């Protein structure tokens, strides 16, 4: 990596001295040394990059977003200087984009990634990085165009393949997605050994009836992406007790279960009142988890945040649930009514995280036709009774009754998570 232009070679002794302070962990002294070099040599790209790298380390030491914001600007400054070597220009803007993403400055990262592609139009990896930037802002359409361009010049780029396949699968182009995800994982290219691509390749195969799916789940388990073939969540705290079905006593949340079952009819009646008088509060399921049929949800809590308008529609239910922070405070779960109609089949799937358990309270359950499989075990609901499963295990639902089926879904923190972990885990 050639990082020194003509002038920087002449001041290499000063540049090396400041960098040695950084490598020895004397970050404060290293920042001031590179700051002095920037003051004395304001056009040196290596001095500016050293300042930015030191600010980068200082932000890690202080855990300061604001210090990192200064580093992000100094990386940009490197690129504006005259006579910047190409390798240093790429490193500086790539680190700038990376740190922008870390801070959640996704639009800024996109501008930086777009500048990189304009400056280095033949660098396929930079286009791949741009595609990631679009995916992180939710722009699947522009991401798809980026990976199409990559695959036109380098058809066997495994990173582009798995990301192109991921987008196809997200767009419900299930059969089309399989060879891209498969060949991309099989390429072994850097960035392809990723649990997300194992997860969606196996799921796409299950949706088309390809029996090879579980061979890929087994390989993902053996490579450390999944806790097991059955439990395939990717946002995990390791060591939590892993079992598909739970009893109320096993969870320890017996007071919550008792209150749900003692008061189930008020929960039912408010749900029915919304069905009859405010049905627009039930929103269609929006994660492509249905093969067919009608499934809608009316959500009272999500990410540990109460929906005030939603609670106007079920005020007694919300009042009841407020006494149980084990569910209202579960920032990796929801509290919601779930209605499912006949002719509905929910694809086998897994939730995102092993940090929650999922309670189902039966509200209106037809006598026949409704059932839920979790792992290798199938059960059914009962009116006024709570079922508890770990939805990080693969589960699947059928509705073949002659009338609607209404349940109440109550997520709780995994009972073995300490209060310290329940406070510091990012919301999902």
């Amino acid at each position: 990596p050639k990082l020194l232009n003509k002038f920087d070679k002449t001041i290499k002794a000063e540049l090396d001295a400041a960098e040695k302070l950084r490598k020895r962990g004397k970050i404060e002294e290293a920042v001031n040394a590179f700051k002095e070099l920037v003051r004395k040599y304001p056009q040196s790209p290596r001095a500016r990059y050293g300042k930015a790298q030191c600010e980068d380390d200082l932000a890690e030491k202080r855990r300061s977003n604001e210090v990192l914001r200064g580093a992000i600007e100094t990386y940009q400054e490197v690129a504006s200087l005259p006579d910047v070597p190409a390798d240093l220009l790429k490193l500086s803007l790539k680190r700038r984009s990376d740190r922008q993403q870390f801070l959640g400055h996704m639009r800024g990262s996109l501008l930086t990634l777009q500048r990189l592609v304009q400056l280095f139009p033949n660098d396929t990896s930079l286009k791949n990085d741009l595609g990631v930037g679009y995916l992180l802002i939710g722009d699947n359409d522009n991401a798809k165009k980026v990976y199409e361009e990559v695959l036109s010049v380098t058809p066997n780029d495994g990173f582009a393949k798995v990301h192109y396949g991921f987008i196809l699968k997200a767009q419900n182009k299930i059969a089309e997605s399989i060879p891209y995800l498969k060949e991309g994982i099989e390429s072994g290219d850097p960035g392809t050994d990723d649990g997300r691509f194992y997860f969606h390749l196996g799921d796409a195969m299950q949706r088309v009836g390809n029996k090879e799916a579980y061979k890929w789940y087994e390989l993902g388990h053996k490579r450390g992406h999944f806790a097991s073939v059955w439990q395939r969540s990717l946002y995990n705290v390791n060591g939590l007790k892993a079992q598909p079905w739970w009893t109320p006593k096993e969870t320890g949340y017996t007071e919550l279960v008792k209150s749900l079952e003692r008061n189930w009819k008020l929960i039912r009646d408010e749900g029915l009142a919304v069905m009859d008088k405010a049905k627009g509060l039930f929103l269609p399921e929006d994660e492509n988890l249905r093969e067919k049929g009608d499934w809608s949800q009316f959500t009272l809590w999500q990410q540990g945040r109460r929906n005030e308008n939603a609670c106007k529609g079920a005020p007694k239910t919300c009042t009841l649930l407020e006494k149980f922070p084990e569910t209202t405070g579960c920032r990796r779960g929801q509290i919601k009514y779930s209605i499912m109609h006949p002719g509905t089949h929910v694809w086998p799937h897994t939730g995102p995280t092993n940090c929650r358990l999922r309670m189902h309270l039966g509200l209106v359950i037809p006598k026949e036709g409704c059932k839920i499989r979790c792992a290798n075990e199938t059960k059914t609901w009962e009116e006024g009774k709570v079922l508890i499963f770990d939805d990080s295990f693969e589960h699947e639902v059928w509705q073949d009754a002659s009338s609607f089926r209404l349940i109440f879904i109550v997520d709780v923190w995994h009972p073995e998570l300490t209060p310290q972990q329940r406070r510091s885990l990012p919301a999902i």
């Binding site: 959640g104 988890l289 999500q302 939730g351 995102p352 919301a427």
Partner: peptide, 18 residues
């Protein structure tokens, strides 16, 4: 988009720095 029942998004958590 959020990962509520499934794992369909590229990332399920928000980027917010330290």
């Amino acid at each position: 988009g959020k990962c509520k029942n499934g794992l369909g998004e590229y990332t399920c958590t928000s980027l917010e720095g330290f």
